[PDB]
Amino acid sequence: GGLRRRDLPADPLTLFERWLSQACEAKLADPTAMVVATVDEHGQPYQRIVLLKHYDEKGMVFYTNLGSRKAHQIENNPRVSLLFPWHTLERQVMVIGKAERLSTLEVMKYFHSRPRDSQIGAWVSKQSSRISARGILESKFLELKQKFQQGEVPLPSFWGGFRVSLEQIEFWQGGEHRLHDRFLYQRENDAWKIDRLAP
Amino acid sequence: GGLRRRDLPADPLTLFERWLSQACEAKLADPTAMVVATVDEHGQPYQRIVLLKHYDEKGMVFYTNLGSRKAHQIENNPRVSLLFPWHTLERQVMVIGKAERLSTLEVMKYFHSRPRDSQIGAWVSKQSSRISARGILESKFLELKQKFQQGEVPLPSFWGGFRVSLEQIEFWQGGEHRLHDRFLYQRENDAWKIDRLAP
Ligand SMILES: Cc1cc2nc3c(=O)[nH]c(=O)nc-3n(C[C@H](O)[C@H](O)[C@H](O)COP(=O)(O)O)c2cc1C
Ligand SMILES: Cc1cc2nc3c(=O)[nH]c(=O)nc-3n(C[C@H](O)[C@H](O)[C@H](O)COP(=O)(O)O)c2cc1C
Ligand SMILES: Cc1ncc(COP(=O)(O)O)c(C=O)c1O
Ligand SMILES: Cc1ncc(COP(=O)(O)O)c(C=O)c1O
Numbered sequence: 001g002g003l004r005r006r007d008l009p010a011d012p013l014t015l016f017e018r019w020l021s022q023a024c025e026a027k028l029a030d031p032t033a034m035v036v037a038t039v040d041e042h043g044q045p046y047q048r049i050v051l052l053k054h055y056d057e058k059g060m061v062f063y064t065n066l067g068s069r070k071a072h073q074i075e076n077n078p079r080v081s082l083l084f085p086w087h088t089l090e091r092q093v094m095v096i097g098k099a100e101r102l103s104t105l106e107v108m109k110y111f112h113s114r115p116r117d118s119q120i121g122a123w124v125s126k127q128s129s130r131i132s133a134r135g136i137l138e139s140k141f142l143e144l145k146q147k148f149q150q151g152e153v154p155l156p157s158f159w160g161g162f163r164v165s166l167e168q169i170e171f172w173q174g175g176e177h178r179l180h181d182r183f184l185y186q187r188e189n190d191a192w193k194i195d196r197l198a199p
Numbered sequence: 200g201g202l203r204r205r206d207l208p209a210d211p212l213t214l215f216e217r218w219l220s221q222a223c224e225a226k227l228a229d230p231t232a233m234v235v236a237t238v239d240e241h242g243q244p245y246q247r248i249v250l251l252k253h254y255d256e257k258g259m260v261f262y263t264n265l266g267s268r269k270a271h272q273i274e275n276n277p278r279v280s281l282l283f284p285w286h287t288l289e290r291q292v293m294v295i296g297k298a299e300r301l302s303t304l305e306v307m308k309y310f311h312s313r314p315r316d317s318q319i320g321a322w323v324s325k326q327s328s329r330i331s332a333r334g335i336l337e338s339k340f341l342e343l344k345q346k347f348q349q350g351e352v353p354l355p356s357f358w359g360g361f362r363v364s365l366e367q368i369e370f371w372q373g374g375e376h377r378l379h380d381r382f383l384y385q386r387e388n389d390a391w392k393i394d395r396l397a398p
Contacts, residue, residue, distance in 0.1 A: 004333070029287035037236040037244040037280065045236040045244045047282040047293055048371075081236065083246040085284040088228035094246055121377035130383075130394040134203070137378045137397070172247075178320035179336045184329075195329040198336070 003173045003181035005196060012169040012185040012192060013057065016093060019171075023086055036062065036164075037081040038073040038099075046073060052082075053110060053161075059097060063110060063161040065127035071160075074099045080164055090174030095166060102161035111155050119153040120144050175199060202372045202380035204395060211368040211384040211391060212256065215292060218370075222285055235261065235363075236280040237272040237298075245272060251281075252309060252360075258296060262309060262360040264326035270359075273298045279363055289373030294365060301360035310354050318352040319343050374398060 009015050023031040032052045039045050048070060050062040060082060064070060074080065082095040111119065124140045131137070148154070169185045180199035185192045208214050222230040231251045238244050247269060249261040259281060263269060273279065281294040310318065323339045330336070347353070368384045379398035384391045 002333075033284070033286055035234045035236075035246065035282055035284060037234075037246050039238050039242055039244050042278075043238055043242070043276050044278040044295065045238050045280040046295070047234065047236050047246075047280045049282070049284060049286060049291060077242050079241075079243040081244040081246045083234055083248070085232070085234060085248060087232055087248060092248060096243065096245070117376045124376075124378060125397045127397050129397050131397045132395070134201075134378075134380065134395065141376060141378065177316045177323075177340060179323060179333075179340065181333065196331070196333065198324045198326050198328050198330045 002175075003171070003183065005183070005194065008183060008194060010192065011057075012166070012171070013055065015171060016055075016169070019086070019091060019093060023089060026089060028086065028088060031086075033085070034060075034062075035083045035085060036070065037083070038070050039077050039079065040073050041076050046070070052084075057166070059100075059163040059165040060095060061102065061161060061163045063102075063107070063159070065122070065125065066158045066160045067129070068127040070128075074162065082164060087174075092170075092172035094170040094172070095164065096168035096170075097165040098167070099162040099164050102163055104155075107160050108155050110161070111159065112153075116150060116153055120148065122159050123153075123156050170197070201374075202370070202382065204382070204393065207382060207393060209391065210256075211365070211370070212254065214370060215254075215368070218285070218290060218292060222288060225288060227285065227287060230285075232284070233259075233261075234282045234284060235269065236282070237269050238276050238278065239272050240275050245269070251283075256365070258299075258362040258364040259294060260301065260360060260362045262301075262306070262358070264321070264324065265357045265359045266328070267326040269327075273361065281363060286373075291369075291371035293369040293371070294363065295367035295369075296364040297366070298361040298363050301362055303354075306359050307354050309360070310358065311352075315349060315352055319347065321358050322352075322355050369396070 033049050035047050036050050037045050037047045052060050054061040078098045080099045084093040123144050167187050171183045173181045182197040184195050184197050232248050235249050236244050236246045251259050253260040277297045279298045283292040322343050366386050370382045372380045381396040383394050383396050
């Protein structure tokens with residue numbers, strides 16, 4: 001029907017929750033899937049999809065291997081962008097913010113909630129490094145599955161997470177004639193300034 | 200069934216064509232949709248989806264408004280990343296490269312191939328700038344529809360395109376236990392060096 005300023009909530013998370021809710025409702029594949037962009041030391045941007053696992057006023061959270069390329073890039077430049085590719089629903093949500101590491105307590109809690117095969121898998125991969133063959137991953141997996149016996153499957157020291165703060169959140173919704181609705185929520189010291197952007 | 204090095208084509212575009220072909224075949228919404236990431240002068244990355252309109256060994260092409268944020272950002276830093284969010288097919292294609300402007304000749308050709316309402320729309324929006332109301336877009340549209348009479352609908356001077364070169368192309372395909380297949384094709388002076396990357 002359209003997206004009019006007068007219908008927007010004060011808090012952008014409120015609109016995001018609604019859009020996330022309807023996305024699950026429409027059964028999109030991986031509704032929590034978002035593309036996270038980071039930048040290396042030479043100014044080159046990099047992208048990969050990760051899953052949003054939690055969000056609130058403090059920011060959006062995802063977990064990853066601390067030795068990965070994104071991790072290395074975030075340590076040198078914490079500025080990141082997140083984009084939810086919801087175009088089958090004629091929508092997009094883009095977030096601008098800084099990524100900060102989650103504490104051990106937060107990570108252990110989420111880690112032990114994952115399927116065991118995934119916990120073991122976490123142990124297996126030296127994420128982003130070049131490896132000579134797939135078999136390396138497969139032998140290790142087997143090796144560890146039995147090594148643990150699974151007693152509790154330990155939290156790898158190289159496993160962690162990041163929380164991306166909400167400095168800016170942009171909502172995009174398809175419009176005919178290429179005239180789409182775009183609203184940019186921008187942090188103004190606790191409060192949110194809203195502007196419609198030309199498509 | 201999996202992705203083994205021995206089954207990879209010498210030229211990454213060959214694998215990309217296959218993946219693009221099957222994506223259309225599976226009727227994904229907007230198979231040519233890709234997330235393009237650019238970086239501003241402060242090192243902050245930005246993202247938005249655009250449509251791939253052509254590709255070959257020289258790079259991947261998309262069209263946009265030359266006064267937009269992405270355009271401004273590319274003029275200051277031509278390094279960009281493209282990511283095709285094909286996860287409903289358990290796949291991802293990420294491209295690293297430099298964006299260069301297309302010539303007038305190339306742009307006119309593609310511009311006049313678009314639906315008239317879209318050509319008029321192109322004229323309407325001062326893409327990315329803040330506008331006070333949606334009505335501004337709607338009045339202009341109407342105004343121009345009749346102004347042209349459509350005799351040929353002129354190419355806006357602020358409309359253009361970019362070609363992103365292929366410096367690196369990464370292929371990702373879902374794997375069980377979180378052990379996914381990842382291969383990175385990297386330009387080595389005309390030739391392509393291939394490495395499997397840990398997931
Ligand atoms: C649907 C989907 C969800 C994914 N979720 C995550 C995630 O939550 N954490 C993660 O580290 N990688 C995840 N990945 C794999 C990443 O895209 C990427 O390959 C990996 O994190 C390494 O990226 P990097 O080399 O840029 O560091 C996911 C991939 C897909 C397609
Ligand atoms: C499926 C889809 C396809 C799109 N294709 C394009 C495109 O080809 N060119 C373009 O300028 N914007 C396109 N857009 C709109 C962009 O995502 C974005 O809103 C716009 O280019 C302005 O981005 P910027 O402010 O970062 O410059 C598309 C959006 C969607 C959801
Ligand atoms: C490398 C990697 N880590 C984590 C995840 C997902 O997080 P979780 O397994 O806790 O749901 C994925 C999902 O595809 C992944 O590919
Ligand atoms: C702003 C904008 N320009 C261009 C396009 C698509 O290119 P074209 O209309 O030539 O197919 C889109 C598609 O959503 C768009 O949103």
